[PDB]
Each structure stands twice: as structure tokens, then as C-alpha cells.
Design a binder for this molecule. Structure first.
Ligand SMILES: *C(=O)[C@@H](NC(=O)Cc1ccccc1)[C@@H]1NC(C(=O)O)=C(CC[C@H](NC(=O)CC[C@@H](NC(C)=O)C(=O)O)C(=O)N[C@H](C)C(=O)N[C@H](C)C(=O)O)CS1
Length: 346
């Protein structure tokens, strides 16, 4: 009973994003078995190669939904209790035993986000970490140089630190790398042939969109940010995928294929973000103008803005990508793909 997707409106969104500084922008809709696919602009601005909806890209913080699915399958298996203390599983990690796994997964832990220090200056910060390899503990120690910012559970405050903890939990409780767990629990069963976790490798396998970091100086030249370790994010940000594979993943999630019903319900217990948005457990809700809510996640790793959202039953999914970042006009414009794709023509 959804409106038809509006391709003319999608086309206008991409064209606007280009006019605001995205080298390329694209979107794929899987509408209950009917595909919509549009792209405009360039995957590589120096060579001129066109962007296309099959280009792989860095999904950034969409990674948190993959990490959350692994953790919730561990809850299904009896290996993890969401209301247990992080420090019960990782003794001595955090300065407060009251911080629970559920709080970290919903950004209610109070843990300071180290990435504000790292990327205070956008391009210098990128140059500082792009070729660094961090352990999970290194990143937690960077957070803990600062006090928590709120009491456990008390407020929503997004922090990459939370999903660094998530990766440490995954590796401790399984004895495997997050790469292995993602592959065995998600990428292989869903046949996500364009989806990878290669950290700390800097190469994007196969044909990909290059990423272009916008400098903090208005009008400044773009920086190619395609090749980096993403070691500053890991289980908070380092998955590589495609529009088809993120559509498959969020459709599978919402249609109940990736965990028990009970754990999907836990994943959708919404913490208020604003009057039109919530945060579950590694999962975002956005409320659209026509009265529809959609479910998924955004990403903003250097040079790539991703939106990947599905309807409640998974039957319609949409993934949009612009290959720039640090450009709020572009970021806001690309959100409009969800309106056109789900709410259709005005
Ligand atoms: C995941 O991708 C992760 N991203 C990074 O860790 C990269 C990075 C780069 C520099 C500094 C810090 C981190 C997180 N992603 C996202 C995301 O997907 O959006 C985060 C949420 C980011 C912030 N969003 C808001 O502040 C949204 C407010 C909300 N409300 C309305 C009604 O106003 C809304 O707009 O929906 C955020 O920081 N936004 C800015 C614009 C931003 O993303 N800045 C970076 C530099 C960019 O534009 O590239 C948290 S990090």
C-alpha cells in the first residue's frame, strides 16, 4: 500500500546534490521486486568515469547495523545479555560497571566520542588517521581520556566509541574477528557479493566510487579520500558494500530473516532523537512527511554519504550514496531520496 516511487523526484534530488558539490550521486530502490536505479555525475572526478549504482563504496556508520545484528544473534544464542554490564564481559574496560550492552548499542552510555578530537579539522584529521592502524583498546583509551558526558542510560548522545565496544564484545565472546562473524552470519547467508570488511586494507575491491572529502574552507579543492584503513572506526564504520547489497540486508532484517522476533523487537525499541527520528539498537527510524516510517541507517565516512532504509516489512528498500562528505547541503539533499522513494509524487 505504498505510493509508487517518484523517479522524476529522485532525479531532481541527485541533480541538486551535484549542484551542491557532490561529484556523483545515485540511488537504488527495490520496490517489492521492481527495481529503480538512477545515478548522475562521476565516480572519479579526475578521470571522468561515470558513477553507477553497481559501484562499491564505503558505507560508514551503516556498519553499526551489521555489528548490531551479530550481537543480537549472540543474544539469541545465549551468549550475551543486553542488560549485563559491558565490564562483566570485558573486565576493567569502562570506568562505570553500570554501563550496559543495551546502552552502548543505543548511544545511551555517556562515553565520549573520540572522533570529535580526531576530525575537528576535517582534512588534517583525515590525513592524520587515514594510514593508521588502531587496536580496539587504543580507541577506547582515547575516549576515556575524557569524562563521560552523561550518566548511564540518561540521554542519547551518538558516539562511535559505543560501536568500538561492540566490536570488542563480538571478538571476545566469539573468539573470532569481526570480519569472520560478519561473513559467516550476514554476508554469506544473504549472498552479499559486493560486501566486504577488509580492515586494515586500504583498497576497495572491484569497481568503486572514489570518495571526495570537502575541506572546511568554503570553495576549497576536494581531497580524494577513497583509500584509508578506516581503523579509527572498525565495527563502527569500515564495511564496504553496494546499493543492491544494503537493500538486500535491510530488507532481510526488517522481514525477520536475521534474528528471532524477540531480538528484532529489542532492536526497534526507539530512543527519541527528535520529533521525526529514533535510534534502536544499531538502527535508525525516520518518520517521513506522508506518515510512513522507515528503518535502517546513515553513514558519513570521509568522502561518502549513505542512506539505507527499508519499510517496516522489508518489501521496499532504498539505498542512496553521494561520493562526498563534510557538505551539509549535500547531506540534507540526499535525505530527500527517502521522500521520493517512499512517499512518491506530491
Ligand atoms: C558514521 O558514519 C559516523 N561517521 C563518522 O564517524 C565520520 C566523522 C567525520 C567527522 C567527525 C565525526 C565523524 C557517524 N555518522 C553519523 C551519521 O550518519 O549521520 C553521525 C550523526 C552525525 C551528526 N548528525 C546530526 O548532527 C543530525 C541532526 C538531525 N536533526 C535535525 C532535525 O537537525 C539530522 O540532521 O538528521 C553530525 O555530525 N552531522 C554533521 C552534519 C556531519 O555528519 N558532519 C560530518 C563531517 C559530515 O558532514 O561529513 C554521527 S558520526
Amino acid at each position: 500500500d505504498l505510493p509508487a516511487p517518484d523517479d522524476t523526484g529522485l532525479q531532481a534530488v541527485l541533480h541538486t546534490a551535484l549542484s551542491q558539490g557532490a561529484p556523483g550521486a545515485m540511488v537504488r530502490v527495490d520496490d517489492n521486486g521492481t527495481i529503480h536505479q538512477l545515478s548522475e555525475g562521476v565516480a572519479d572526478r579526475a578521470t571522468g568515469r561515470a558513477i553507477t549504482t553497481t559501484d562499491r563504496f564505503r558505507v560508514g556508520s551503516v556498519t553499526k547495523s551489521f555489528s548490531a545484528v551479530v550481537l543480537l544473534q549472540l543474544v539469541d544464542e545465549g551468549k550475551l545479555d543486553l542488560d549485563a554490564s559491558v565490564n562483566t564481559y570485558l573486565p576493567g574496560l569502562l570506568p562505570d560497571d553500570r554501563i550496559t550492552v543495551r546502552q552502548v548499542m543505543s548511544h545511551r552510555s555517556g562515553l565520549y566520542d573520540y572522533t570529535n578530537d580526531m576530525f575537528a579539522q576535517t582534512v588534517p584529521g583525515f590525513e592524520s588517521v587515514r594510514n593508521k592502524v588502531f587496536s580496539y583498546q587504543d580507541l577506547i583509551t582515547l575516549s576515556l581520556k575524557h569524562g563521560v558526558t552523561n550518566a548511564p542510560g540518561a540521554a542519547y548522545s551518538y558516539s562511535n566509541t559505543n560501536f568500538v565496544v561492540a566490536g570488542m564484545l563480538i571478538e571476545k565472546l566469539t573468539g573470532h574477528s569481526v570480519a569472520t562473524e560478519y561473513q559467516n552470519r550476514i554476508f554469506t547467508p544473504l549472498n552479499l557479493t559486493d560486501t566486504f570488511y577488509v580492515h586494515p586494507d586500504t583498497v576497495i575491491p572491484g569497481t568503486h566510487a572514489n570518495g571526495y572529502l570537502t575541506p572546511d574552507e568554503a570553495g576549497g579543492a576536494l581531497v580524494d579520500s577513497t583509500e584509508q584503513t578506516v581503523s579509527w572506526a572498525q565495527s563502527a564504520g569500515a564495511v564496504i558494500s553496494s546499493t543492491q547489497d544494503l537493500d538486500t540486508f535491510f530488507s532481510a532484517l526488517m522481514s525477520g530473516q536475521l534474528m528471532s522476533a524477540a531480538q528484532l523487537a529489542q532492536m526497534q525499541q526507539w530512543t527519541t532523537v527528535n520529533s521525526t527520528q529514533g535510534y534502536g539498537l544499531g538502527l535508525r527510524r525516520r518518520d517521513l512527511s506522508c506518515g510512513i516510517s522507515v528503518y535502517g541507517h546513515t553513514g558519513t565516512v570521509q568522502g561518502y554519504y549513505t542512506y539505507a532504509f527499508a519499510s517496516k516489512d522489508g518489501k521496499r528498500s532504498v539505498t542512496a550514496l553521494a561520493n562526498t562528505s563534510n557538505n551539509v547541503n549535500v547531506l540534507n539533499t540526499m535525505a530527500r531520496t527517502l521522500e521520493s522513494a517512499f512517499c512518491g509524487k506530491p
